[PDB]
Amino acid sequence: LPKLVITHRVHEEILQLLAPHCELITNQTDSTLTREEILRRCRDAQAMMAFMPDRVDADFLQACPELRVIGCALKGFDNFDVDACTARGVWLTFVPDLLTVPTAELAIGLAVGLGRHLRAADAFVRSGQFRGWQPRFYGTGLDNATVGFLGMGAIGLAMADRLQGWGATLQYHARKALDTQTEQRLGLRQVACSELFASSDFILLALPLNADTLHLVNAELLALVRPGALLVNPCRGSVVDEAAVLAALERGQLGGYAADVFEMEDWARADRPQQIDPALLAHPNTLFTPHIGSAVRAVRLEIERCAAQNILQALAGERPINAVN
Amino acid sequence: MLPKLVITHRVHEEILQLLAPHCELITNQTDSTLTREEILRRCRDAQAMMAFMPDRVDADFLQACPELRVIGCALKGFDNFDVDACTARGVWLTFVPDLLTVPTAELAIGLAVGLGRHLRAADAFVRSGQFRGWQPRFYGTGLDNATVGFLGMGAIGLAMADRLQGWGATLQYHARKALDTQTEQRLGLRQVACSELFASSDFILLALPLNADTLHLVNAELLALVRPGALLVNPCRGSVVDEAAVLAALERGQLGGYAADVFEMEDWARADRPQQIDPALLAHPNTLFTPHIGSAVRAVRLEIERCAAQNILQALAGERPINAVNRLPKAN
Ligand SMILES: NC(=O)c1ccc[n+]([C@@H]2O[C@H](COP(=O)([O-])OP(=O)(O)OC[C@H]3O[C@@H](n4cnc5c(N)ncnc54)[C@H](O)[C@@H]3O)[C@@H](O)[C@H]2O)c1
Ligand SMILES: NC(=O)c1ccc[n+]([C@@H]2O[C@H](COP(=O)([O-])OP(=O)(O)OC[C@H]3O[C@@H](n4cnc5c(N)ncnc54)[C@H](O)[C@@H]3O)[C@@H](O)[C@H]2O)c1
Secondary structure, X not given: OOEEEEOOOOOHHHHHHHOOOOEEEOOOOOOOOOHHHHHHHHOOOOEEEEOOOOOEOHHHHHOOOOOOEEEEOOOOOOOEOHHHHHHOXXXXXXXXXXXXXXXXXXXXXXXXXXXXOHXXXXXXXXXXXXXXXXXXXXXXXXXXOEEEEEXXXXXXXXXHHHOOOOOOEEEEEOOOXXXXXXXXXXXXXXXXXXXXXXXXXXXXXOOOOOOOOOOOEOHHHHOOOOOXXXXXXXXXXXXXXXXXXXXXXXXXXXXXXXXXXXXXXXXXXXXXXXXXXXXXXXXXXXXXXXXXXXXXXXXXXXXXXXXXXXXXXXXXXXXXXXXXO | OOOEEEEOOOOOXXXXXXXXXXXXXEOOOOOOOOOHHHHHHHHOOOOEEEEOOOOXXXXXXXXXXXXXXXXXXXXXXXXXXXXHHHHHOOOEEXXXXXXXXXXXXXXXXXXXXXXXXXXXXXXXXHHOOOOOOXXXXXXXXXXXXXXXXXXXXXXXXXXXXXXXXXXXXXXXXXXXXXXXXXXXXXXXXXXXXXXXXXXXXXXXXXXXXXXXXXXXXXXXXXXXXXXXXXXXXXXOOHHHEOHXXXXXXXXXXXXXXXXXXXXXXXXXXXXXXXXXXXXXXXXXXXXXXXXXXXXXXXXXXXXXXXXXXXXXHHHHOOOOOOOEOOOOOOOO
């Protein structure tokens, strides 16, 4: 039986699916294992199921000469040397875009949770202090607010779709303009970047991490915001300068920051932060999630099934449906 | 001689200015709620009252305030105000029919997402300093492809259905009256029986007033019907659900979760009301709570106060208040 290494915990159904066809070396824990431990497991493996924290470069592959396929439970290229894969005759597969929708859902949850002070609200009830309706605990809603999107691709559109009927005025800035018919359907108006930060009550980020988008949301752009403005980051940590965000919060100019992603997980950068600043983590005007954008059971199960089906295709000798090479 | 107006809770300065020409104001410009005893004392010789969520007006209250012409409520659900007793005393009762709807609807949906996505525990984890990167954790329930069931389909029910239009869910509802076909078609709403709603829904969103028919409607029997993992969200009134039965359903792991902006302990018109939220519910991990902040948006509260102020002025000027709940004799 061909050997398969699964680097992270999967649903038992996935183990049940693969076991008849593969000898399984599994990691049914919550932990990410060391690169050394992964290399050890994969040395004589014919297949790998890889997840977001996995990094595949030329060196990794050379140390796994029997590898025929890496089935990824993901969609991004950044961690995987596609050209080195083909060069060593290894199939690299990704999943179709099942991640955008749950992320967009979470982003809007984060906007409402941040605007309505949900962390502090829930803490107040849980503590036993609630004795009835009180005239305070004020927040900001979406109705009549201006929502600005920085970027307008897959998640930008998914979020704009889900804000239809919320009574907001939608605006965006993107490197590529939307076609006129989409703009009119969604009620989106294109604005300049400086204008987006100057005039938005909510700023929802919807852009990728590039050399040119690194720290795009910096002290200069944040200095433009309306006092009390809310910033939501479901994209990548490093499109934002987290130091500058924290300073804008402590100044009281930025009203809140919600994030699913953090500068510290963007490993390619030499002087990336090693953690999230404890003072950011302690700030009251925040709401955080541990990169759970696609953390919907049905979605995660389907992603894993896709990866698993792609691995079985490659092992049976055929070209996998979601082969990227 | 200006009519005396008792205002039980703090109001914006701009509302105090609109009323001051026509009324002597007996105010409570603190953050606190006064006792029953204190409110009765201030209203003894009052012509008007602006009441808020903590207020309760029964026959006994009105008997001790015989000069009252109007009670203007800054709320929509007037379950704690005895309408018939007001009418018997020739007192107008007014409410606010629409202004609370939208921020409450926004909140209800934010609660649904927060509850389904394990936001409380997820945030706590990041704040602990222990985040290292993606983990196969916090897998939850999203709206895409879910069955969303509404119990009640009035202003808040409709505002929520509106806000879910691009979310890829299957929307169904139970109400006392069906929506017309055209509205159902436009919003993708399918009418179902109550037990059907409870048996089939991934999310159950309550949008019902508190009355004798809805009192403990969401009871043990209905909760025994839910698909294991089902999420229940209550933005309306605490006592529409039996909190004891809800906790029990969470503890056996059948109900996947309960989110609530409102609590049984607030429903004063009940003789047997719980005096607190059960510490075991408050401590349960599969929850998400907010302290009756449905309409707590400054710009909205100002308009709510204004509506109530305007109704009170209309009554005091001798006309029929536009948002009167009851009807008094008027010269034709
Ligand atoms: N948190 C999560 O779980 C999660 C889930 C899905 C995607 N994401 C992340 O979200 C990001 C965006 O994803 P997507 O699929 O929408 O990307 P996309 O490529 O579909 O769209 C990107 C958009 O950003 C715009 N853009 C690029 N550079 C810009 C710039 N300098 N200024 C303004 N706009 C610019 C583009 O024109 C485009 O409109 C990705 O980096 C992805 O990794 C995160
Ligand atoms: N959390 C908050 O701050 C907040 C804000 C506004 C309203 N509320 C509460 O929410 C309630 C609903 O508000 P609304 O504006 O939608 O009220 P509404 O009167 O506009 O609509 C209530 C709906 O429930 C239906 N209904 C009544 N009894 C029913 C039953 N037994 N079975 C099925 N359906 C029934 C009615 O047919 C009506 O469609 C209010 O009465 C109030 O108690 C809370």
